[PDB]
């Protein structure tokens, strides 16, 4: 470690990039997630009171708590209703243009988003197949269920989807097309159910974490509230989304004044938040901007449903008799999670207060920001999920201490509970860290969490080369890499790219090209690379013809549109090729026919969305017009 701290010609801040476990395997989560999920569920109940009384906390419902009860010496879950209301008021009064643009978003383009964008989401646990399905499949199955059990056709807008969910939730009995039936309580429990799974490829901590994904029924509400949160976050200077750190770095203060710099993280960030605080925040903003009531319900339903979450507890606790091991569900035998036995509902478990990762990473940031807005907090704050940086600009050291302490207390007011061990404050400003960026005087250093893959993506030679060079270019643009690093990385990528496509040594492709007198004219064939550090933003084929390394006859041969095989800035060619109890493989093929007839008839869908009212048989209207 003494070798990572230079004392001359270079400061430790720049060499802190060496304190990264690059090029090593990322930690991988093994076994059952039941213990981790149970711990995640039980943490918020252990921090509600200063004295740990878990059993009393399992029946609290609304997590509002009185002052002189928030744990100031440790984690504290819950929130103070009056504090939340006042802080939301203060945040609403400030940042008026952000509120006006939120009003624009919620009045004009809110009833405009297509509901098909839920297909580009994350893995979803289907409530009909009783397993995990891709998001487009889950969306299609859910809309078929809605059509069957509601009899009204779903409109293109996602407001129609939300109305359909709300209407179908009031039916006492529902049946899917097979021909399985759902009770209303069963469907409600499925909506409450949260599918938890291990979080993979997570570097930066010793202990593995679990993330939870919502059901497709509530995903529309989750997406609308998340989109509103993102829209209001893009237009506030205290958010963690844009150059904010560099902007605050380029700040000059008074000649003789105390300028603090607090950089820290959040401990138990998802184990100390209550959806009711988010409810209060959103209701305050909506009420003081002047939206109608149906907007109130539309924005409040997601947290209402999340207050009754039924996160799945994995596969069960691990019990060992001798050398044997067994997986046992909670409650079968005594353990350290006996207080949650009463809340076990089948394979799932009920927890009224608490949060999970991957659900609301923007509304939590909004809650933290509304906590920031106060009177005596005359400083600069940047918040992004569980990481933050704060700049103090006051006149006295004790004033800075009071500001930091009231910042901590106000964060605790809504239950943020920043980690004391992870928070570092520097009396003179100039050194700090936020996200993976590092601050030293007037320079901010961007250090990547992951190195570029430096390997072909794995689709086709031209696409893989284009994506690799673009990734290297993005890495060098963000300041993470420089001349030497960029050139070395592109040499490494060139070697890996040539190896992966049988262009190194003796192999089938090289022997085939040698025996038939086929001269390798491209990088994937085995030719010398044409791309340089400056020219890495140029296409290979376009660059080779200018230098005379690719004869026009060869271009005619390869760029033939009548070719057997046929952002990505690569021209199509012969090298643009695609590598070769479910009971669902047939319907993806018949959907292929539906997608096949389109993009052959309509140039329009290749430009914009399919905005054609009706159009069930109605496609014949276009074909007749083509003839006419």
């Amino acid at each position: 470690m003494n070798l990572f701290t230079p004392l001359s010609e270079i400061n430790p801040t720049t060499t802190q990039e060496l304190l990264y476990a690059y090029t090593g395997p990322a930690p991988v989560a093994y076994g059952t997630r039941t213990r981790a999920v149970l711990e995640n569920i039980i943490r918020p109940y252990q921090y509600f009171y200063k004295e740990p009384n878990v059993q009393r906390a399992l029946d609290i419902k609304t997590g509002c708590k009185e002052p002189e009860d928030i744990n100031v010496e440790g984690p504290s879950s819950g929130f103070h209703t009056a504090s939340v209301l006042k802080l939301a008021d203060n945040f609403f009064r400030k940042y008026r243009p952000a509120m006006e643009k939120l009003k624009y978003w919620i009045l004009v383009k809110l009833p405009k988003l297509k509901y098909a964008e839920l297909s580009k989401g994350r893995q979803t646990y289907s409530f009909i197949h009783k397993r995990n399905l891709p998001a487009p499949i889950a969306l299609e199955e859910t809309v078929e269920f809605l059509e069957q059990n509601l009899r009204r056709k779903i409109g293109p807008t996602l407001l129609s989807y939300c109305q359909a969910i709300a209407d179908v939730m009031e039916l006492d009995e529902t049946t899917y097309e097979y021909t399985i039936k759902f009770s209303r309580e069963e469907l409600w429990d499925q909506m409450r159910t949260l599918n938890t799974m291990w979080k993979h490829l997570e570097r930066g901590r010793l202990n593995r974490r679990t993330i939870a994904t919502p059901s497709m029924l509530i995903r529309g509400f989750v997406k609308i509230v998340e989109d509103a949160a993102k829209e209001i976050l893009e237009n506030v200077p205290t958010s963690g989304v844009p150059e904010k750190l560099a902007k605050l770095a380029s700040k000059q203060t008074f000649h003789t004044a105390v300028t603090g710099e607090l950089s820290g993280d959040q401990e138990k960030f998802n184990e100390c938040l209550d959806p009711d605080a988010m409810r209060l925040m959103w209701t305050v903003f909506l009420r003081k901007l002047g939206c109608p009531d149906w907007i109130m319900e539309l924005f409040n339903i997601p947290f209402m449903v999340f207050k009754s979450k039924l996160a799945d507890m994995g596969e069960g606790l691990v019990y060992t008799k001798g050398k044997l091991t067994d997986r046992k569900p909670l409650g079968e035998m005594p353990s350290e999670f006996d207080d949650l036995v009463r809340n076990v509902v089948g394979n799932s478990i009920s927890c009224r207060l608490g949060m999970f990762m991957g659900m609301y990473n923007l509304t939590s940031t909004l809650l933290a920001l509304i906590s920031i807005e106060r009177e005596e907090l005359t400083g600069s704050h940047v918040e992004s999920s569980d990481d933050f940086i704060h700049f103090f600009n006051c006149k006295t050291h004790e004033e800075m201490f009071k500001q930091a302490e009231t910042l901590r207390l106000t964060l605790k007011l809504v239950g943020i509970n920043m980690s004391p061990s992870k928070c570092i404050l520097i009396s003179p400003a100039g050194i700090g860290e936020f996200n993976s960026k590092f601050h030293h005087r007037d320079f901010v250093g961007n250090v990547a969490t992951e190195l570029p893959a430096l390997v072909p993506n794995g689709t086709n030679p031209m696409t893989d080369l284009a994506m690799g060079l673009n990734v290297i270019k993005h890495s060098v643009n963000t300041g993470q890499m420089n001349l030497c690093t960029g050139a070395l990385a592109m040499r490494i990528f060139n070697h890996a790219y040539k190896y992966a496509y049988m262009a190194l040594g003796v192999t089938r492709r090289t022997r085939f090209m040698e025996e038939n007198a086929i001269t390798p004219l491209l990088t994937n064939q085995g030719a010398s690379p044409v791309h340089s550090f400056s020219t890495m933003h140029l296409d290979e084929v376009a660059l080779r013809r200018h230098l005379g390394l690719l004869d026009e006859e060869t271009l005619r041969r390869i760029l033939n549109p009548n070719n057997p095989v046929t952002e990505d800035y690569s021209v199509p060619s012969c090298f643009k090729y695609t590598l070769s109890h479910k009971a669902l493989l047939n319907k993806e093929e018949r959907y292929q026919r539906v997608t096949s007839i389109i993009n052959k008839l309509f140039p329009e869908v290749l430009i914009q969305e399919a905005s054609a009212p009706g159009t069930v048989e109605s496609l014949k209207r276009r074909l007749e017009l083509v003839v006419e």
Partner: protein, 104 residues
């Protein structure tokens, strides 16, 4: 490997068992044979060290039984990426002592 004279350099051999692998993180049986320079009991307690006699020369052969996942093997097949960070430090130092006086 090959030195720049054509000669072959035998670092060792790795043997891959049946390895009926299903999941991307599943382990795969391996029997790794390596040419060791100096044996140490407390440094290699799980290795078996054998004497090797080629052309009246002395070499130590180490055999270990390991199982290693596909993800880790793929990661270590790209071990050449470890050169970037020292290259980053060297480049930053050199370019600082080029920005000081406009002289590379």
């Amino acid at each position: 490997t090959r030195d720049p004279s054509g000669n072959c350099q035998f670092w060792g051999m790795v043997l891959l068992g049946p390895h009926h692998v299903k999941r991307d993180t599943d382990n795969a049986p391996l029997l790794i044979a390596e040419i060791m320079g100096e044996d140490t009991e407390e440094k290699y307690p799980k290795h078996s060290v054998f004497s090797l006699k080629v052309e009246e020369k002395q070499f130590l052969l180490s055999l270990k039984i390991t199982s290693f996942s596909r993800n880790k093997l793929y990661t270590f097949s790209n071990i050449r990426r470890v050169l970037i960070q020292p290259a980053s430090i060297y480049s930053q130092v050199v370019l600082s002592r080029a920005a000081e006086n406009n002289s590379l």
